[PDB]
Amino acid sequence: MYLRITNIVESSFFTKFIIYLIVLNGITMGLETSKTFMQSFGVYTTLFNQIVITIFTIEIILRIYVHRISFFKDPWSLFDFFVVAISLVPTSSGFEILRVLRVLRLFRLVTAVPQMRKIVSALISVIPGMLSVIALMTLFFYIFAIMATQLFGERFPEWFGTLGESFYTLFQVMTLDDWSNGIVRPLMEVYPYAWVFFIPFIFVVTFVMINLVVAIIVDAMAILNQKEEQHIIDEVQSHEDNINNEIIKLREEIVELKELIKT
Amino acid sequence: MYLRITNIVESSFFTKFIIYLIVLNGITMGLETSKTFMQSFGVYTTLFNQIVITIFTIEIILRIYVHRISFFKDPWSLFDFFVVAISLVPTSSGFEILRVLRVLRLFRLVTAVPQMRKIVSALISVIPGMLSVIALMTLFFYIFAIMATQLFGERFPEWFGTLGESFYTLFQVMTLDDWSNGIVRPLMEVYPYAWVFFIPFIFVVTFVMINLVVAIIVDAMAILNQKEEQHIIDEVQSHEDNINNEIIKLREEIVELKELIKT
Amino acid sequence: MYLRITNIVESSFFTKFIIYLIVLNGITMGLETSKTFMQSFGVYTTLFNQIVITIFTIEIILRIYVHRISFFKDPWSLFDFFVVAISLVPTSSGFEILRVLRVLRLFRLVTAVPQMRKIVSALISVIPGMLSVIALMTLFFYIFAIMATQLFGERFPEWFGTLGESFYTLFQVMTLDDWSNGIVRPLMEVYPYAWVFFIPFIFVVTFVMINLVVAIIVDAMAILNQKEEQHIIDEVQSHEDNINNEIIKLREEIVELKELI
Amino acid sequence: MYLRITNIVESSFFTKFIIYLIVLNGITMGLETSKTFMQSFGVYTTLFNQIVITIFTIEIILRIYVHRISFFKDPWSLFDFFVVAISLVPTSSGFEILRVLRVLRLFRLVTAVPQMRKIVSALISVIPGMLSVIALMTLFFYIFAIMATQLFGERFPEWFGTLGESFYTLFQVMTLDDWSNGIVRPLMEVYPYAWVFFIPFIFVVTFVMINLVVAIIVDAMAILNQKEEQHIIDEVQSHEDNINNEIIKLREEIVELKELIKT
Numbered sequence A, B, D: 001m002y003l004r005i006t007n008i009v010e011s012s013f014f015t016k017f018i019i020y021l022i023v024l025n026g027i028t029m030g031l032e033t034s035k036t037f038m039q040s041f042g043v044y045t046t047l048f049n050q051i052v053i054t055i056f057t058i059e060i061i062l063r064i065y066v067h068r069i070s071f072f073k074d075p076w077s078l079f080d081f082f083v084v085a086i087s088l089v090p091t092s093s094g095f096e097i098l099r100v101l102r103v104l105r106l107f108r109l110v111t112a113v114p115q116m117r118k119i120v121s122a123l124i125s126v127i128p129g130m131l132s133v134i135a136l137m138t139l140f141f142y143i144f145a146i147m148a149t150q151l152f153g154e155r156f157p158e159w160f161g162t163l164g165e166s167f168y169t170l171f172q173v174m175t176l177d178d179w180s181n182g183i184v185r186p187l188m189e190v191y192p193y194a195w196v197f198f199i200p201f202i203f204v205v206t207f208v209m210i211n212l213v214v215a216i217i218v219d220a221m222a223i224l225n226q227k228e229e230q231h232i233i234d235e236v237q238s239h240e241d242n243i244n245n246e247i248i249k250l251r252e253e254i255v256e257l258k259e260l261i262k263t
Numbered sequence C: 001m002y003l004r005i006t007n008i009v010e011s012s013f014f015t016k017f018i019i020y021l022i023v024l025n026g027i028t029m030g031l032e033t034s035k036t037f038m039q040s041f042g043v044y045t046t047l048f049n050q051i052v053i054t055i056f057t058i059e060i061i062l063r064i065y066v067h068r069i070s071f072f073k074d075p076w077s078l079f080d081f082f083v084v085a086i087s088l089v090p091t092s093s094g095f096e097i098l099r100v101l102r103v104l105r106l107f108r109l110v111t112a113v114p115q116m117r118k119i120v121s122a123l124i125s126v127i128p129g130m131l132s133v134i135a136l137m138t139l140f141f142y143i144f145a146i147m148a149t150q151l152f153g154e155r156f157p158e159w160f161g162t163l164g165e166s167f168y169t170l171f172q173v174m175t176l177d178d179w180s181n182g183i184v185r186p187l188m189e190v191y192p193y194a195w196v197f198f199i200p201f202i203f204v205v206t207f208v209m210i211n212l213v214v215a216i217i218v219d220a221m222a223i224l225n226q227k228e229e230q231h232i233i234d235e236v237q238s239h240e241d242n243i244n245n246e247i248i249k250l251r252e253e254i255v256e257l258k259e260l261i
């Protein structure tokens, strides 16, 4: 029976039908936004929602028997899995956050549609090279968050009270969000020199972001000229000393013609 | 009189003419902006408008004969068609919003000037390949919109009472416009963890844009290496398939001295 | 024998002296900020400005005499000229707002030095390639100013009442400055769909500013690849043509042992 | 005795120990941020600072011994040194920024981890290039800062009262941080034409930042594209001086078959 289900999971009808259920379920996810619509139709869509989660788990289990292990070595399939698992947690209780994370299920449309995975893939690819810089930055934030909390916390607690208080505030400053009328000018009333802290924080952070981008584009170029030079260097050494194997059978031949002297 | 009017339409004069009207009428739409002006000279401009609109209509008509079905397959003409059609909906009456849409007819200066035509064309060219990602972002927005609305709308209706509402705010946050003192910190007095929503949102949004920009730059400079490489790659073969061919000649010239075979 | 003075205007010391001046006067421009200073040393320093300003006048005259018409085809000169002419107009005058422009004479430091000049010159060079887009965009503003004025100027005259008013505001919205909480959201409390005007506006202008940067970088690299292959090909071709010079005299003296028999 | 110490100092145990010490010390410094923690465990903390501060003074000395004057011509070491100094000075004194500047010793984790000082390097490496542009802009600011102080400082003393205050506001404007509603929009009430100063300032300032990027990127690439030229032209160079070097012997195996006229 294994091959019998495998023909299904792999059909064009399967993926389209699941893509189809993703999409319209998405539309219902959106209609539950309206409190008006939720009245005249609430039980309809929650029903619908239960049908979709059913079909999805059906599907996901099928996919597992058809792919087992390979399935769990697949980033994309793990996603659908966890994102479906979440939806499978009951419409209940105090930790009511999960009712809302059920709208993550719509990200299946990203898994289900190949054009889109490529985009997500292309995006993630940039990340691992950056993990070093991310560390350095987070270190830099940490160190400055500490100083903030200490230098500024007592008189300005909404902003620099806790450690995490200052983290949030320093993120805002980085996005240059209302940074000067909004935070530093207040600070400077008590502590006139605050700028000696915030002006450098701004230049370093902005500096790094910008440059990091420059480096990315330019280093990527550097490897493109690499493969190109290779490809062309590979040519002058494919030719030339293949025109060497022919200018020495001039040589072998030229000296094959050297008992002109015997006569 | 097909050929007689084709001659007029296609002439340099006609085009220079329509352009000149476009400039005057655009100068006068700026003057129509002054309440002070209309009281003194406003009689003059409601007919100037009413006859430039008339002249333009005539033109659009002519041009249609002169190109028939091919006129309605030209982007630039189709524009002129609509942008002048909208200016025909009554001098008053209908709705007064189509009287504001009237001023759009100055974009006919972009349409009727071929430096502008291509400059716009240049700009539009990067879009159709972007389309996929525009969809991915839109889905991202929309999921988050659904999410923000049922997390912050009951308590913060101004910002999150509706999908549309939350679509707006999330756009605001994307442009980083007064996002933290302006939306999130208030949200956070009622909901201390709002940062776990919006900071992830900010990264994704921002990360996608920037990398999108890198990709365009970085991929375009790839294609340029392609055509340069094969330009160069072809030209070594032209001057190195030339070499080994006239050493084949020399190799043979040596085997011309087979005439040692005379003995 | 005017040439005498010509050798002095051109001298290393003529230029180096004027730069000492431009820097000095520039250090006094700053201290004329401290009203603390400008009582205790006001007279002391107003002369310094009077000396400097006459010297520069002299300098400009000499440069003129030396370079004649060719002086007025030189922007760097033309600038020096106007920025000094400006400073000439007395003070009190008709309006203490040309007294302010006087400061602009410090940019003479950009003039007096290369490197500085190269860089200014460097930056400007992208501009002429841009005159077209700058115009399309200006048309784009103009059009949306006219539209914004007449759509919102009635109830929002501070932001959109006058044509120039709408220009200023659309400029602010372009820099995304307090655009939503400070402008559109207020607008929408009277005119709900006003987002249909501002979101597209922001998209258009943002898109244009980014692409233009992308076009500059990539079209730059294309010109850089034109030059590259032509240096590589003009190499490959020429040597490859090096190789056929040693082939024809390894050829037509393989014809003398052939003519041998 | 040198080489015995030298081999300890260069040990990866030495390095890893100091790195470890750097890291746990960083963990305690965030703990000092809590007022709860400092109550219940603050004495545990303040001695560990002493410990680490000693150990590092030891570490720095062992290293000066090992490297002699080579140590003092090393930026990363100079830093490690200068940062340990600050942490040395007795707690309090009259000004207690030093009891805060002490959290800079965490930056040692940068100098200590070889992968981090690499990216700081790459970053720093861009600066020398732009020291001229910097000067240009620093002047430009100065000039505009003088100009605004004496145009808006009497009536707007907070923003423009002194030179210093004008530098701060112009920097605020440069970052485009709340510029219009805030500074510029108020100013224009008193001085209507103030847009004539803050639009130019903004164009110039943002143009120059933005182009400056373009110049790095594109000139970086011009250099990249040239090292490619050499590598390619070098192979060509090689073949056509080095095979005429070894068929110059084939150039004289043809005069031998000539020369055999003689008797």
Ligand SMILES: CC1=C(C(=O)OCCN(Cc2ccccc2)c2ccccc2)[C@@H](c2cccc([N+](=O)[O-])c2)C(P2(=O)OCC(C)(C)CO2)=C(C)N1
Pocket (backbone or CB within 6 Å): A174, A175, A176, A206, A210, B174, B175, B176, B206, B209, B210, C174, C175, C176, D174, D175, D176, D206, D209, D210
């Ligand atoms: C929505 C948005 C931004 C924005 O509107 O902030 C104003 C930027 N700015 C002048 C400026 C920038 C830096 C230091 C000093 C001054 C600007 C904006 C519009 C027109 C002209 C200039 C800024 C930005 C600023 C700060 C933080 C972040 N973040 O974490 O995503 C983004 C950037 P960026 O990479 O910034 C750099 C330039 C050359 C402008 C290109 O884009 C993007 C990608 N996102």
Ligand SMILES: O=P(O)(O)OC[C@H](O)CO
Pocket (backbone or CB within 6 Å): A030, A031, A033, A034, A035, A036, A037, B162, B163, B164
């Ligand atoms: O007015 P509502 O409550 O029906 O919701 C309006 C939304 O924009 C449509 O879903």
Ligand SMILES: O=P(O)(O)OC[C@H](O)CO
Pocket (backbone or CB within 6 Å): C030, C031, C033, C034, C035, C036, C037, D162, D163, D164
């Ligand atoms: O305090 P003042 O009056 O001496 O002026 C301070 C300025 O920042 C010095 O140039």
Ligand SMILES: O=P(O)(O)OC[C@H](O)CO
Pocket (backbone or CB within 6 Å): B034, C162, C163, C164, C165
């Ligand atoms: O009435 P105004 O002030 O908009 O005048 C029109 C000009 O374009 C700007 O002054």
Ligand SMILES: O=P(O)(O)OC[C@H](O)CO
Pocket (backbone or CB within 6 Å): A162, A163, A164, A165, D030, D031, D033, D034, D035, D036, D037
């Ligand atoms: O305020 P505390 O003492 O509970 O600590 C909160 C900080 O973010 C944790 O160090």
Ligand SMILES: [Ca+2]
Pocket (backbone or CB within 6 Å): A176, A177, A178, B176, B177, B178, C176, C177, C178, D177, D178
């Ligand atoms: Ca802002």
Ligand SMILES: [Ca+2]
Pocket (backbone or CB within 6 Å): A178, B177, B178, C177, C178, D177, D178
């Ligand atoms: Ca703001």
